[PDB]
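2024-03-11 09:14:02 INFO queue: dequeued item Carbonic anhydrase 2, len=258
2024-03-11 09:14:02 INFO validating residues
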Amino acid sequence: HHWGYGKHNGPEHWHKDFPIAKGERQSPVDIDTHTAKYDPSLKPLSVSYDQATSLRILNNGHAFNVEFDDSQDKAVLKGGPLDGTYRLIQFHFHWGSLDGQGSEHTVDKKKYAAELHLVHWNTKYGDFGKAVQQPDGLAVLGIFLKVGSAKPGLQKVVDVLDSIKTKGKSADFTNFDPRGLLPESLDYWTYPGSLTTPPLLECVTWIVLKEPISVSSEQVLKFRKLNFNGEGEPEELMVDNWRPAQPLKNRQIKASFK
Ligand SMILES: NS(=O)(=O)c1ccc(C(=O)NCc2ccc(C(=O)c3ccccc3)cc2)cc1
Ligand SMILES: [Zn+2]
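2024-03-11 09:14:37 INFO prediction written
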């Protein structure tokens, strides 16, 4: 009985195996744009993915991860609310069964069709495992997806999904440039939060971009053809793999713009 997104193992059940699910710094959250405040202390955000080295794509039973070689200082995120350098380790998405839902963070309660998470770990901690035990160990850059025009840079990911349809399947995925998934503007909101899936660790500095990228209906439809199940098991489409907004509690969301 593993955690998941169904009626009997979904978000409302996670707290039993992962008590921190009812913690003081859980993610995602609804971003109330009128309550968020411009923060002059934020430094310019720097996304440097020019030397990014992708290696593989994997269906892990809850989403698919495009993994990167993070043994060297390549794709890094710095600046903004961050102190130091954070290295890109993987990206994945959360999406819905319908275009009207799918994102984890919401903006004035608005839900987008999907949300991309580019996961980075603080290099002061040596590696990802050590980083996820620190309060400033990770930085996740979140980007909303809306359905409209296709995103050319996403097509390479879409086309390989046929080969990793079920849980446990992986496929070589080299030379993918994540710069092709970024919107024009880097305006963002930021707040201290957590991993949005078990173990739900509270080690993340969230940076959520205000401008969503557009993807076509055809592209998101292919995301929805993936399976939560393993090969040869009853088919459960991989849709609605998002956690709903959690209590903001004692936190303030800061904006990088006025
Ligand atoms: N959706 S999100 O961007 O917030 C998000 C990002 C990344 C992971 C993730 O990496 N989960 C897998 C994982 C693997 C190992 C450890 C780990 O080393 C550890 C586990 C429990 C306690 C201490 C460390 C933690 C998470 C989960 C969610
Ligand atoms: Zn995620």
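2024-03-11 09:14:37 INFO annotate: The two ends are 47 Å apart (CA to CA).
2024-03-11 09:14:38 INFO item closed
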